[model samples]
Target chain A: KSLKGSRTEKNILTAFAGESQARNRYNYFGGQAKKDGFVQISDIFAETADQEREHAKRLFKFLEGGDLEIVAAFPAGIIADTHANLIASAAGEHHEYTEMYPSFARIAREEGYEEIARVFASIAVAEEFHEKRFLDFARNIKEGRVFLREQATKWRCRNCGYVHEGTGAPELCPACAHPKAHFELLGINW
Target chain B: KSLKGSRTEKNILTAFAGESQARNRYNYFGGQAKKDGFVQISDIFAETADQEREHAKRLFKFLEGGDLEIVAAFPAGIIADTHANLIASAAGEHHEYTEMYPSFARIAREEGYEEIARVFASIAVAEEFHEKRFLDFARNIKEGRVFLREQATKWRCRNCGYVHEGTGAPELCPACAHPKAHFELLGINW
Candidate 1:
């Protein structure tokens, strides 16, 4: 925060770095969830983690400078426990929605950067949706109605890439609004 | 499955084939992880999958023939939706540990390729650990009460590469027996 205009720009580079690390960390946590046996929790982590990665991809576009194909150890944090993991997951999403992206977006606007501010704004909204959804599950888990995935009959919405677990495919795509006939069985087993 | 060799020596060749395939597949999976923004998984997949390349190095020691760096027996699955991705992972590891590695090991023992047989005997057990770990996560995904990981004050072992996260660093290195002071702090934030 103390550097000149250069410093403000520099702030974003590290922000990109941090997001890059967080993005990777969640997916690994997602994997850890599956290993521990909470398929539904694993799905949440995987979905959220990938969304975080999408955030990083957008943030990378406004690095104030550019460097691609970066490398660093993300530590790939593992969440082998469900309840505690949700507590942590919800917290991180809340921060991104309420604080981190907001600050970064404001800084970009104040710094006379339009494109950066625009993307940051878009990502901020996305994070808010992510935060609320995560909180719903967390609150449910806290109440003891743990929503872990169980049904092996998985369906893939080919048009929109929305995968679902149940005995039958959805009549319409919750993700892409497509018809059930567009869905295909993955023939998944437990 | 049939080839012209000392039937005994040929078993080693096929064993070499499986490792070779596992190697390339890891590399491929590693690539997908990165594309999906799982930088850490991608990294491990990249580095560890490449480690698959080196196994053929040892396999080459007993290839009893040529061209082993390229190879698959278990039809390695790739990711789509990350949850179902976990399912494919469980199955792939199970196939390798329970069927692929064990069958290959037995064929080697029935023959006279002692060195080749020794590695198969050894690695199969390791894959068993790997397989069970994967399945536990899967069944948990299939069942319930599954848990996951979170972050805290993370520390790295100066002597060994093991890293741990919690409220405080451990008094001793779990991997290399290093003292508390030997731990370097990562200073990560959620």
Candidate 2:
């Protein structure tokens, strides 16, 4: 079905608006994380911010010509410190993947826009990944494990992109001479 | 007035969402303009994008917590050529200044949120400035006057901070050695 005057059309615009806000919010959170000395979390937020921007770009292509009126509510809160922000980010990602985008995808499917439905579903999966990453970072912070690992792990320098494998982050980045705080704990594929 | 359940609260969120989307949209347009070799226009878009980000930050302060639903519409169109983008941007700015924000400001006043009303009004004025700048750039592009001045005028290099007063852009930037197209026509205060 054509997007013009369809419910799916409004959904696309709504999703575009949501992705755009998500991008800015993540960038703001990234800045807060960097200032608070959680550089790896900052990198995660920045990487997710870029992902949201790409999502907005893809959704924007479905917009034809005109304004779209949408009835939607956005996540809201007072700006808080980095730890609080990380928890909030995790909650938001959890909501999107588990609740919001799933409903949006279902609506698209019901409205005969299977292609758009698939797009929404794919974004939902990406949001799940974001949620997992945010939750892991929050857990590390809560447990005081940001720089120490249970087992040997790869830590990458946020400043110079150098990697070191150990049970704890190096006292200084081996390649760039930056402090230990500059190195981010990394997973196998992250 | 408390913002907890007010129309003005929703309006603030709506405005925040609008500003966020505007920032990302302008950044995207900036990339398009830069790729098309309209470096000055790209700079203008980047500058405006930052302005919108600040606007979002300011509006975000009004949110206490909890999500609020809003009824809103956003501008729509296919991403077009840079010249077309300039014209569309001017139109969007024109709408914000002359139609959208004025009405929103009035509603804020009616809802006993005079402070928020003032914020909306101030943003409307900013939109007017953006509208004027976009319109001026569009005019220059349409009239084939992008690199020319009616009289001796200040032309600033887009590649570097070099400024020269001439009837036309310098053959090469004195400081950076970039071509004439790299110089942007400048006004006294712009």
**TM of each candidate vs. truth:** 0.37, 0.48
Candidate 2 per-residue lDDT over residues A56-111, each given as its tens digit: 77678877879778998888754577778878888887887788778888988998
| Kept native contacts, fraction for each prediction | 0.00, 0.00
On a 0 to 100 scale, what is the lDDT of residue B110 in model 2?
Answer: 96
Docking quality category of candidate 2 according to DockQ thresholds: incorrect
**Candidate 1: lDDT of B107?**
73
lDDT by residue (tens digit), candidate 1, B40-116? 33443454344345445555555434443323345645546423544565466567658865776677667655555
Q: lDDT tens digits, residues B1-190, model 2?
A: 6888877788789888888888888899899888877777887788778777766776787789887788888877557778788888888888877887788789999988787787777677667767767888878878877888678876755443345678888786543445776667643210
Please state the i-RMS of candidate 2: 21.9
Instruction: Tell me, by lDDT, which candidate is best.
Output: 2
Off by over 4 Å in 1: A1-7, A64-80, A147-190, B1-190
Candidate 1 positional error at B173, Å? 47
Model 2 scores a C-alpha lDDT of 0.74
Instruction: List the candidate 2 regions with Cα displacement exceeding 4 Å.
Output: A1-190, B186-190
